[PDB]
Amino acid sequence: GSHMANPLAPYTLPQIATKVQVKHVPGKGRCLYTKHDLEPGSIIFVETPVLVAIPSLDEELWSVLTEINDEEALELPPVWHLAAICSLTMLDDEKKKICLDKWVPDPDRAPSDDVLRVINRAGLQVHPKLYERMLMVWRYNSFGHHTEQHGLVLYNRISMMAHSCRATACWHYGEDDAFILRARVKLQAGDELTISYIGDDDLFKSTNVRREKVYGWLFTCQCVRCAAPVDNARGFRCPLCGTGAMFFKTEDGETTSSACTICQAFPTQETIQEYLDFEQAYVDRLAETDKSDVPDAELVYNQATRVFAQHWVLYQLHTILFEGYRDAGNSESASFHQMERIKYVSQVMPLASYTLAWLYEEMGDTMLNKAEESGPEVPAHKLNVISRHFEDAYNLLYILCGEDHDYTVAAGTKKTACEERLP
Amino acid sequence: LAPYTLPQIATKVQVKHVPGKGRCLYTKHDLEPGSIIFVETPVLVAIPSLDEELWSVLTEINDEEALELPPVWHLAAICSLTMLDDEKKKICLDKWVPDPDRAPSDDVLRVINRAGLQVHPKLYERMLMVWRYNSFGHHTEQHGLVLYNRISMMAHSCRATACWHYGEDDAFILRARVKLQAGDELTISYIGDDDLFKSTNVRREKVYGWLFTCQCVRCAAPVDNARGFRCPLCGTGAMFFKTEDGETTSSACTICQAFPTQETIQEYLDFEQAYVDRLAETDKSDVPDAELVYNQATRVFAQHWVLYQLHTILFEGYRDAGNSESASFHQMERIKYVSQVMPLASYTLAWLYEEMGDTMLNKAEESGPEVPAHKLNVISRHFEDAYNLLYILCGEDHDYTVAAGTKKTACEERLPAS
Ligand SMILES: [Zn+2]
Ligand SMILES: [Zn+2]
Ligand SMILES: [Zn+2]
Ligand SMILES: [Zn+2]
């Protein structure tokens, strides 16, 4: 008999914890649905912030916080703490309960070292437990300010939208930090409205990376992109045929591959591990590669083409090279790399994005420059082609930020100028 | 309950013929891409030099009264009944035909009477069908056909697992186009490469003669990504049309995910037919006209074989005129299209990569013979891709493969020391 007690005896809470695992609801805790039919680009609603935490909101407290930070660095930068404290002191009791009951990864978290130190050093009256609660509500529910670099903004209804790597809704800031929410796609009444918790600088990357970016909200993303059978953002050059793409995919810590697009062969697990090592090596190299040294980026790109076929690392190298060539006035190769960028993004992330729209616009710029090196009279055909790209940019920006937005009117301006120069 | 007559039965049910060419073929071994599966000699090579007297006769009866099938088919059929031993004459007569019971055509009885041959009409007729539905065009000779025994046992696929090319003495060299395991089916395209990159409706039209509606992996795919129109709502995404049982539906737009109405679908089908008609009057000898048609076509199409055809016309026109700048753009669009709709190894794709290499090398050389390393490497990549595909299609030592690899190694030789 190896029983230490009767197995039917009631457990203690620690003993229960040994057997089972509670999972708290994925951030940000709620789903939001449209009540009506929406056409692409139409406004769903516009929301004013609960609070805009700016140094300008309380610079007394700001100087104090920055000086506390300079003496002993604090885990979250000062802005998060100005936001939290001003959320506990500046709003009404109701506004307060609106932010305290938003989603948080650790509801019962004890006050951190940082929190108690701020309370004692700045001598404030707010409860440490609520101070902690609020620092995480803004860590996991706010948006970065549009212009001011140490600024953040919280909204109430916006936090109700679940995450998706292929979001149904897009957004942009209005004039007084208004949050303008638009339909990114055609929607029917009752459809879910989702936004990307992850920035556009990572949305074009592969499933493993995006999942790493949203793990903080304590879920493994299973959105339509993230759960797709083929991760077409993670393609390696097949070593058998030398030209097709094999797309890798990681689930439960194990990586598998699609069959090569051309020769239909599957790589062995040993080849998969080999190319995962290559992948990590080039991810590391990307941090040392940039547009101020184009020869170096050319070296890295040449080496990377042997490893990658339609991969976000290769897209990043195309980006570096395009910006380097564009800055140097070399429209010829900038053109090639920009066309590869358009190919990649339209395969991997086809819905309207600022990245794609400005890919089309900047392709228009590059083509127009290259053409104008032959003289101002650019032939009709070329003009039309250039115009098409500008138009595409317009068409996407129209959906993302509206007819009269500065981006949209810029793209449309270039388009109509192109038409103006037509015979 | 009284028995039906045969016409009464035919009113109620529809019989499905064994689809041409009647058989399936499977590999007994694992195959690497590009490996030779086997090489087969022809049962017969029908060319004028096979029987010049018969040929001259044939010609003159054709010029008096035109034959429905050109003379070479009759040369093939007759010579199959006259010149082959009994063993091989039976292998030909055993081959798939659409109409086993078909009475002698009037062309057949005429040729029998005016050439004065002793062959049985009904066999003659049947042999015709055999050669029309089982033979290949000769590599060199116009008015030439070739018929093989084992090759005819491969079923058709628009995404074939096997590829082929002619060797010396009209040998049929069959290679694996993809990696295959023992027991996998060997298929070839009954459709020429001039149609393989087109949409499912068109390919099915091209194989209807073998009496089946193609349901290969491409034709049965939920989305026909060779038939993509420009979404009228968003102005930028693609909506892919699909036709089944005479009715056309559309995928949601790739960008705004709206579905077109049946009205919009019919409108864009009318546009599609109009541009298919215009293609017959559009070609590379009038580049301005093709530019007009392309400019109007971009408003209708997003990723469509008609747009690919216009890209092809413009690429060849600009290439012939030495305009590497515009040819570059259109060739890139061609590569995009083909690699999306027809990604497996093909001569079309391989030579798309090779000619992209040519165009970029020309364009670069307009700046001087010393082409920078980067550009060279990119150019080399294209050449290498061409090589890689032709290696699979026709072997390492084939003239095509050697040509692509030659351009590639030349590119590498021009690279600076550092
Ligand atoms: Zn996801
Ligand atoms: Zn491969
Ligand atoms: Zn098919
Ligand atoms: Zn659309």
Short mmCIF file of C-alpha atoms in Angstrom, two decimals, chain A:
data_model
loop_
_atom_site.label_atom_id
_atom_site.label_comp_id
_atom_site.label_asym_id
_atom_site.label_seq_id
_atom_site.Cartn_x
_atom_site.Cartn_y
_atom_site.Cartn_z
CA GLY A 1 0.00 0.00 0.00
CA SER A 2 1.51 3.26 -1.25
CA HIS A 3 -1.44 5.43 -0.23
CA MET A 4 -0.44 8.19 2.17
CA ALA A 5 -4.09 9.14 2.70
CA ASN A 6 -7.49 7.92 1.56
CA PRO A 7 -7.83 8.80 -2.16
CA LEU A 8 -11.43 9.92 -1.52
CA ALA A 9 -10.38 12.41 1.16
CA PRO A 10 -10.86 16.03 0.03
CA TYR A 11 -7.76 17.67 -1.43
CA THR A 12 -6.08 20.83 -0.27
CA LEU A 13 -5.85 23.59 -2.86
CA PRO A 14 -2.09 22.97 -3.36
CA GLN A 15 -2.87 19.27 -3.84
CA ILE A 16 -5.53 20.15 -6.41
CA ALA A 17 -2.99 22.37 -8.17
CA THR A 18 -0.69 19.35 -8.55
CA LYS A 19 -3.32 17.55 -10.63
CA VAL A 20 -4.91 20.22 -12.83
CA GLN A 21 -4.02 23.42 -14.69
CA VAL A 22 -6.32 26.44 -14.95
CA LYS A 23 -6.07 28.53 -18.06
CA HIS A 24 -7.18 32.13 -17.91
CA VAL A 25 -9.06 33.52 -20.91
CA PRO A 26 -6.78 34.68 -23.75
CA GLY A 27 -6.23 38.41 -23.93
CA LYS A 28 -7.80 40.73 -24.34
CA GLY A 29 -10.68 38.65 -23.03
CA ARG A 30 -13.61 39.57 -25.27
CA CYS A 31 -14.97 39.36 -28.81
CA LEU A 32 -16.74 42.14 -30.77
CA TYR A 33 -19.20 41.69 -33.65
CA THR A 34 -20.81 44.06 -36.15
CA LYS A 35 -24.59 44.50 -36.03
CA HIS A 36 -24.81 45.58 -39.69
CA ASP A 37 -23.46 44.87 -43.14
CA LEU A 38 -20.23 46.73 -43.83
CA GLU A 39 -18.59 47.49 -47.12
CA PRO A 40 -14.77 47.67 -47.19
CA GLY A 41 -13.39 50.94 -45.86
CA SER A 42 -16.59 52.08 -44.15
CA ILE A 43 -16.40 53.45 -40.61
CA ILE A 44 -17.61 51.05 -37.91
CA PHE A 45 -17.23 53.59 -35.12
CA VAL A 46 -14.89 56.28 -33.80
CA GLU A 47 -13.88 56.22 -30.13
CA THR A 48 -12.37 58.80 -27.83
CA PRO A 49 -9.63 57.61 -25.45
CA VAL A 50 -10.26 56.71 -21.84
CA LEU A 51 -6.89 58.39 -21.27
CA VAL A 52 -3.94 59.65 -23.30
CA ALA A 53 -0.84 59.22 -21.16
CA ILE A 54 1.65 61.84 -22.33
CA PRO A 55 4.35 63.56 -20.25
CA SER A 56 2.10 66.61 -20.75
CA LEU A 57 -0.56 64.96 -18.55
CA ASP A 58 1.48 65.42 -15.35
CA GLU A 59 5.10 66.54 -15.78
CA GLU A 60 5.66 66.77 -12.02
CA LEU A 61 5.07 63.01 -11.81
CA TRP A 62 6.98 62.56 -15.07
CA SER A 63 10.20 64.20 -13.86
CA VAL A 64 9.92 62.16 -10.66
CA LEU A 65 9.42 58.92 -12.61
CA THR A 66 12.27 59.57 -15.07
CA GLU A 67 14.64 60.35 -12.20
CA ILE A 68 13.61 57.18 -10.36
CA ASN A 69 14.30 55.37 -13.65
CA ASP A 70 17.73 56.97 -14.07
CA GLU A 71 18.82 55.97 -10.56
CA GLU A 72 17.63 52.35 -10.81
CA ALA A 73 16.16 51.19 -14.11
CA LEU A 74 12.54 50.05 -13.81
CA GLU A 75 11.23 47.00 -15.67
CA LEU A 76 8.52 48.79 -17.64
CA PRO A 77 9.56 52.28 -18.86
CA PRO A 78 8.13 55.34 -17.05
CA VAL A 79 5.21 55.86 -19.49
CA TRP A 80 3.43 52.73 -18.29
CA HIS A 81 3.60 53.97 -14.70
CA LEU A 82 2.40 57.49 -15.49
CA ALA A 83 -0.49 55.83 -17.34
CA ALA A 84 -1.36 53.55 -14.43
CA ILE A 85 -1.10 56.15 -11.65
CA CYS A 86 -3.03 58.75 -13.64
CA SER A 87 -5.63 56.06 -14.28
CA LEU A 88 -5.98 55.58 -10.53
CA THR A 89 -6.04 59.30 -9.62
CA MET A 90 -7.46 61.26 -12.56
CA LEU A 91 -10.67 59.49 -13.56
CA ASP A 92 -14.04 58.97 -11.93
CA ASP A 93 -14.87 55.85 -9.91
CA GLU A 94 -16.78 54.45 -12.89
CA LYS A 95 -14.05 55.13 -15.50
CA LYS A 96 -11.72 53.44 -13.02
CA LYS A 97 -13.72 50.19 -12.84
CA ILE A 98 -13.78 50.25 -16.62
CA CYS A 99 -9.98 49.92 -16.67
CA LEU A 100 -9.48 47.75 -13.55
CA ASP A 101 -11.78 45.03 -15.00
CA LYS A 102 -10.06 44.88 -18.40
CA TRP A 103 -7.91 41.88 -19.22
CA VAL A 104 -4.69 41.15 -17.37
CA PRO A 105 -2.39 38.09 -17.50
CA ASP A 106 -2.12 37.72 -13.71
CA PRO A 107 -5.26 38.91 -11.88
CA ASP A 108 -3.92 38.09 -8.39
CA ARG A 109 -0.39 39.42 -8.90
CA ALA A 110 1.28 40.86 -5.82
CA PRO A 111 2.76 44.38 -5.99
CA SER A 112 6.12 44.36 -7.74
CA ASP A 113 9.35 45.78 -6.30
CA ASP A 114 9.05 48.63 -8.80
CA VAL A 115 5.51 49.47 -7.68
CA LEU A 116 6.26 49.67 -3.96
CA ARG A 117 9.37 51.73 -4.70
CA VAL A 118 7.37 54.21 -6.80
CA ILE A 119 4.65 54.42 -4.13
CA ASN A 120 7.19 55.19 -1.41
CA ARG A 121 9.48 57.47 -3.46
CA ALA A 122 6.73 59.53 -5.12
CA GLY A 123 4.57 59.27 -1.98
CA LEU A 124 1.20 58.55 -3.60
CA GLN A 125 -2.03 57.32 -2.04
CA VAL A 126 -3.12 54.58 -4.47
CA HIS A 127 -3.41 50.93 -3.50
CA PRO A 128 -0.33 48.88 -4.55
CA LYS A 129 -2.49 45.97 -5.74
CA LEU A 130 -4.48 48.25 -8.05
CA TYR A 131 -1.28 50.00 -9.17
CA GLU A 132 0.07 46.64 -10.32
CA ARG A 133 -3.28 45.66 -11.84
CA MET A 134 -3.33 48.90 -13.84
CA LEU A 135 0.26 48.75 -15.09
CA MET A 136 -0.59 45.43 -16.70
CA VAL A 137 -3.97 46.59 -18.05
CA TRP A 138 -2.15 49.25 -20.01
CA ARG A 139 0.73 46.90 -20.89
CA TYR A 140 -1.78 44.54 -22.50
CA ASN A 141 -4.60 46.87 -23.64
CA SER A 142 -3.16 50.22 -24.82
CA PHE A 143 -1.85 51.60 -28.10
CA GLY A 144 1.30 53.56 -28.76
CA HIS A 145 0.80 57.27 -29.33
CA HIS A 146 0.84 58.49 -32.92
CA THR A 147 3.63 61.10 -32.73
CA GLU A 148 4.97 61.44 -29.19
CA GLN A 149 7.40 58.59 -28.76
CA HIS A 150 6.89 58.11 -24.98
CA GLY A 151 3.10 58.05 -25.20
CA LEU A 152 0.30 55.52 -24.94
CA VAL A 153 -3.50 55.57 -25.34
CA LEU A 154 -6.29 53.41 -23.90
CA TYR A 155 -9.80 52.88 -25.20
CA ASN A 156 -12.66 50.88 -23.72
CA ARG A 157 -14.55 49.38 -26.67
CA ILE A 158 -11.40 48.82 -28.76
CA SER A 159 -10.08 46.41 -26.12
CA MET A 160 -13.11 44.18 -26.79
CA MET A 161 -11.79 43.00 -30.17
CA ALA A 162 -9.97 39.67 -30.27
CA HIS A 163 -6.66 39.26 -32.07
CA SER A 164 -6.21 37.91 -35.57
CA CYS A 165 -3.19 37.83 -37.85
CA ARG A 166 -5.75 38.35 -40.66
CA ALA A 167 -7.89 41.04 -39.06
CA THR A 168 -11.39 41.93 -40.25
CA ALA A 169 -10.97 45.56 -39.15
CA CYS A 170 -8.34 48.25 -39.63
CA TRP A 171 -7.82 51.47 -37.73
CA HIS A 172 -6.11 54.84 -37.71
CA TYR A 173 -5.88 57.86 -35.43
CA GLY A 174 -8.13 60.86 -35.84
CA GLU A 175 -7.14 64.36 -34.85
CA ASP A 176 -7.67 64.34 -31.07
CA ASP A 177 -6.30 60.81 -30.64
CA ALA A 178 -9.65 59.52 -31.87
CA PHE A 179 -9.61 55.83 -32.80
CA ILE A 180 -11.23 55.42 -36.22
CA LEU A 181 -12.25 51.80 -36.76
CA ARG A 182 -12.98 50.76 -40.36
CA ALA A 183 -14.01 47.53 -42.03
CA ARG A 184 -10.94 46.05 -43.73
CA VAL A 185 -13.06 43.57 -45.71
CA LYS A 186 -16.67 43.13 -46.79
CA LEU A 187 -18.66 42.05 -43.69
CA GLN A 188 -22.16 40.78 -42.94
CA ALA A 189 -24.23 41.51 -39.86
CA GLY A 190 -22.98 39.36 -36.99
CA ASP A 191 -19.45 38.87 -38.34
CA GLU A 192 -16.62 39.19 -35.83
CA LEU A 193 -14.45 42.31 -35.78
CA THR A 194 -10.78 41.52 -35.13
CA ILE A 195 -7.62 43.62 -35.05
CA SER A 196 -3.95 42.71 -34.99
CA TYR A 197 -2.38 42.88 -31.54
CA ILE A 198 0.96 42.74 -33.37
CA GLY A 199 2.53 45.57 -35.33
CA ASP A 200 2.82 45.73 -39.09
CA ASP A 201 6.60 45.26 -38.84
CA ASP A 202 5.93 41.63 -37.85
CA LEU A 203 2.62 40.79 -39.55
CA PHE A 204 4.34 39.69 -42.78
CA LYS A 205 6.58 37.25 -40.92
CA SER A 206 5.96 33.53 -40.41
CA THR A 207 3.58 31.78 -38.03
CA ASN A 208 6.22 30.96 -35.40
CA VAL A 209 7.25 34.62 -35.19
CA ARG A 210 3.72 36.04 -34.99
CA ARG A 211 2.88 33.49 -32.29
CA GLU A 212 5.97 34.58 -30.36
CA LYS A 213 4.69 38.15 -30.63
CA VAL A 214 1.26 37.36 -29.18
CA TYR A 215 2.32 34.82 -26.52
CA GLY A 216 2.19 37.64 -23.95
CA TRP A 217 -1.61 37.57 -24.16
CA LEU A 218 -1.28 33.91 -23.06
CA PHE A 219 -2.60 32.09 -26.11
CA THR A 220 -1.09 30.21 -29.04
CA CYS A 221 -2.68 31.97 -32.01
CA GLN A 222 -4.95 29.77 -34.12
CA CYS A 223 -6.25 32.43 -36.50
CA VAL A 224 -6.88 31.62 -40.15
CA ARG A 225 -3.28 32.42 -41.10
CA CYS A 226 -1.71 30.88 -38.02
CA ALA A 227 -3.70 27.62 -38.37
CA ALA A 228 -3.24 27.29 -42.15
CA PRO A 229 -1.79 23.93 -43.27
CA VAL A 230 0.95 25.71 -45.26
CA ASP A 231 2.96 28.59 -43.80
CA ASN A 232 3.79 30.27 -47.11
CA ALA A 233 5.83 32.93 -45.29
CA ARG A 234 8.44 30.31 -44.31
CA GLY A 235 9.67 28.84 -47.59
CA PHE A 236 13.11 27.35 -48.09
CA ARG A 237 14.79 26.52 -51.39
CA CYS A 238 14.36 22.79 -51.99
CA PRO A 239 17.83 21.16 -52.07
CA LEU A 240 16.65 18.34 -54.35
CA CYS A 241 15.44 20.34 -57.36
CA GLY A 242 17.18 23.60 -56.39
CA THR A 243 14.29 25.87 -57.38
CA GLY A 244 11.01 24.98 -55.64
CA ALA A 245 9.91 26.03 -52.17
CA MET A 246 9.32 23.83 -49.12
CA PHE A 247 7.31 25.58 -46.40
CA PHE A 248 8.12 24.73 -42.78
CA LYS A 249 5.54 24.67 -39.98
CA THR A 250 6.01 24.23 -36.23
CA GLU A 251 3.32 22.79 -33.97
CA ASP A 252 3.84 21.54 -30.40
CA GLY A 253 7.58 22.13 -30.71
CA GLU A 254 7.91 19.89 -33.78
CA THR A 255 8.66 21.20 -37.27
CA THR A 256 7.36 19.58 -40.47
CA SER A 257 7.50 20.63 -44.11
CA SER A 258 5.16 20.78 -47.05
CA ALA A 259 6.20 18.95 -50.19
CA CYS A 260 8.33 21.02 -52.55
CA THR A 261 6.19 23.18 -54.83
CA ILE A 262 8.01 21.93 -57.95
CA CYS A 263 9.43 18.44 -57.42
CA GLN A 264 6.95 17.45 -54.64
CA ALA A 265 9.66 15.88 -52.46
CA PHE A 266 9.53 16.04 -48.67
CA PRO A 267 12.76 16.93 -46.84
CA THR A 268 14.03 14.57 -44.18
CA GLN A 269 13.91 15.61 -40.54
CA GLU A 270 17.70 16.00 -40.72
CA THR A 271 17.36 18.42 -43.64
CA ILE A 272 14.62 20.23 -41.71
CA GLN A 273 16.95 20.70 -38.73
CA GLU A 274 19.78 21.81 -41.04
CA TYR A 275 17.59 24.50 -42.60
CA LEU A 276 16.24 25.58 -39.21
CA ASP A 277 19.87 26.23 -38.24
CA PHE A 278 20.34 28.20 -41.47
CA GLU A 279 17.15 30.13 -40.70
CA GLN A 280 18.32 31.14 -37.23
CA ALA A 281 21.76 32.11 -38.57
CA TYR A 282 20.19 34.49 -41.11
CA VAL A 283 17.75 35.90 -38.54
CA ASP A 284 20.85 36.73 -36.49
CA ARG A 285 22.59 38.23 -39.53
CA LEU A 286 19.61 40.52 -40.19
CA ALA A 287 20.42 42.50 -37.03
CA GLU A 288 23.85 43.28 -38.54
CA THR A 289 22.46 44.11 -42.01
CA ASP A 290 21.01 47.47 -43.03
CA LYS A 291 20.64 49.97 -45.86
CA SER A 292 23.69 52.08 -44.94
CA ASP A 293 26.01 49.29 -46.20
CA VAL A 294 24.54 48.04 -49.48
CA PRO A 295 27.60 45.94 -50.53
CA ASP A 296 27.25 43.97 -47.29
CA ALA A 297 23.50 43.53 -47.81
CA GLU A 298 24.25 42.31 -51.35
CA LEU A 299 26.63 39.69 -49.95
CA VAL A 300 24.02 38.53 -47.42
CA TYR A 301 21.26 38.47 -50.05
CA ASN A 302 23.36 36.38 -52.44
CA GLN A 303 24.12 33.86 -49.71
CA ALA A 304 20.48 33.84 -48.57
CA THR A 305 19.01 33.01 -51.99
CA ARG A 306 20.57 29.54 -51.69
CA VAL A 307 18.62 28.92 -48.48
CA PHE A 308 15.31 30.75 -48.92
CA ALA A 309 12.46 30.69 -51.43
CA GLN A 310 9.60 32.98 -50.36
CA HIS A 311 10.60 33.65 -46.75
CA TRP A 312 10.19 36.74 -44.59
CA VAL A 313 13.97 36.91 -44.07
CA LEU A 314 14.42 37.16 -47.83
CA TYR A 315 11.69 39.80 -47.89
CA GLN A 316 13.61 41.78 -45.27
CA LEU A 317 16.73 41.60 -47.43
CA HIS A 318 14.70 42.75 -50.45
CA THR A 319 13.50 45.66 -48.30
CA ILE A 320 17.00 46.68 -47.17
CA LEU A 321 18.26 46.51 -50.75
CA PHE A 322 15.30 48.46 -52.16
CA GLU A 323 15.75 51.28 -49.65
CA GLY A 324 19.51 51.36 -50.19
CA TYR A 325 19.22 51.49 -53.98
CA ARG A 326 16.39 54.04 -53.81
CA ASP A 327 18.41 56.30 -51.51
CA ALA A 328 21.37 55.98 -53.90
CA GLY A 329 19.25 56.80 -56.96
CA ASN A 330 19.70 53.33 -58.51
CA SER A 331 16.19 52.79 -59.85
CA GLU A 332 17.22 49.77 -61.94
CA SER A 333 17.86 47.22 -59.14
CA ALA A 334 15.50 48.94 -56.69
CA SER A 335 12.83 48.01 -59.24
CA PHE A 336 13.66 44.28 -59.17
CA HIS A 337 13.74 44.09 -55.38
CA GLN A 338 10.51 46.08 -55.05
CA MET A 339 8.75 43.70 -57.44
CA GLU A 340 9.97 40.75 -55.34
CA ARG A 341 8.58 42.54 -52.27
CA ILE A 342 5.16 42.94 -53.92
CA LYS A 343 5.20 39.24 -54.89
CA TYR A 344 6.02 38.15 -51.35
CA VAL A 345 3.49 40.35 -49.56
CA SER A 346 0.63 39.66 -51.97
CA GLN A 347 1.24 35.93 -51.51
CA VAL A 348 1.70 35.97 -47.73
CA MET A 349 -0.61 38.79 -46.55
CA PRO A 350 -2.99 39.73 -49.38
CA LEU A 351 -5.49 41.86 -47.44
CA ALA A 352 -5.17 45.63 -47.44
CA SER A 353 -2.20 46.91 -45.44
CA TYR A 354 -0.08 50.04 -45.35
CA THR A 355 2.91 47.88 -46.31
CA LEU A 356 1.26 46.60 -49.50
CA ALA A 357 -0.26 49.96 -50.47
CA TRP A 358 3.07 51.74 -50.12
CA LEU A 359 4.78 48.89 -51.95
CA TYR A 360 2.57 49.71 -54.93
CA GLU A 361 3.08 53.47 -54.53
CA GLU A 362 6.86 53.23 -54.23
CA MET A 363 6.93 50.89 -57.22
CA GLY A 364 5.18 53.69 -59.09
CA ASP A 365 7.84 56.14 -57.88
CA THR A 366 10.72 53.88 -58.93
CA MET A 367 9.28 53.10 -62.36
CA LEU A 368 8.55 56.78 -63.00
CA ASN A 369 12.09 57.83 -62.03
CA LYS A 370 13.70 55.12 -64.18
CA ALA A 371 11.48 56.12 -67.11
CA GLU A 372 12.20 59.84 -66.68
CA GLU A 373 15.93 59.15 -66.99
CA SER A 374 15.16 58.84 -70.73
CA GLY A 375 13.52 62.27 -70.92
CA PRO A 376 10.32 63.89 -69.67
CA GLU A 377 8.17 62.50 -72.50
CA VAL A 378 7.49 59.04 -71.05
CA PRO A 379 5.49 56.80 -73.43
CA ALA A 380 1.82 56.13 -72.83
CA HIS A 381 2.22 52.41 -72.04
CA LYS A 382 4.78 53.03 -69.29
CA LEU A 383 2.63 55.86 -67.93
CA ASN A 384 -0.36 53.54 -67.79
CA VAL A 385 1.64 50.85 -66.00
CA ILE A 386 2.94 53.41 -63.49
CA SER A 387 -0.58 54.78 -63.06
CA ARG A 388 -1.89 51.28 -62.35
CA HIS A 389 0.48 50.91 -59.41
CA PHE A 390 -0.44 54.33 -58.03
CA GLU A 391 -4.10 53.41 -58.44
CA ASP A 392 -3.62 50.16 -56.55
CA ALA A 393 -2.01 52.11 -53.71
CA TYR A 394 -4.98 54.47 -53.72
CA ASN A 395 -7.44 51.58 -53.75
CA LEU A 396 -5.87 50.05 -50.67
CA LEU A 397 -5.43 53.29 -48.72
CA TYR A 398 -9.04 54.21 -49.49
CA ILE A 399 -10.01 51.10 -47.53
CA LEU A 400 -7.51 51.58 -44.72
CA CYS A 401 -7.89 55.28 -43.88
CA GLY A 402 -10.61 56.78 -46.07
CA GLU A 403 -11.13 58.85 -49.20
CA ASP A 404 -9.81 62.14 -47.81
CA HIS A 405 -6.82 60.91 -45.78
CA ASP A 406 -3.42 62.41 -46.57
CA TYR A 407 -2.01 59.03 -47.63
CA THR A 408 -4.93 58.30 -49.97
CA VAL A 409 -4.88 61.79 -51.50
CA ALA A 410 -1.12 61.46 -52.00
CA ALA A 411 -1.43 58.21 -53.96
CA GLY A 412 -4.40 59.52 -55.94
CA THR A 413 -2.44 62.72 -56.62
CA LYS A 414 0.40 60.76 -58.20
CA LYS A 415 -2.10 58.66 -60.18
CA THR A 416 -3.95 61.65 -61.63
CA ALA A 417 -0.67 63.41 -62.46
CA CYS A 418 0.31 60.30 -64.43
CA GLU A 419 -3.00 60.44 -66.30
CA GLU A 420 -2.42 64.16 -66.91
CA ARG A 421 0.81 63.43 -68.76
CA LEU A 422 -0.98 60.94 -71.08
CA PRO A 423 -1.61 61.73 -74.79
#
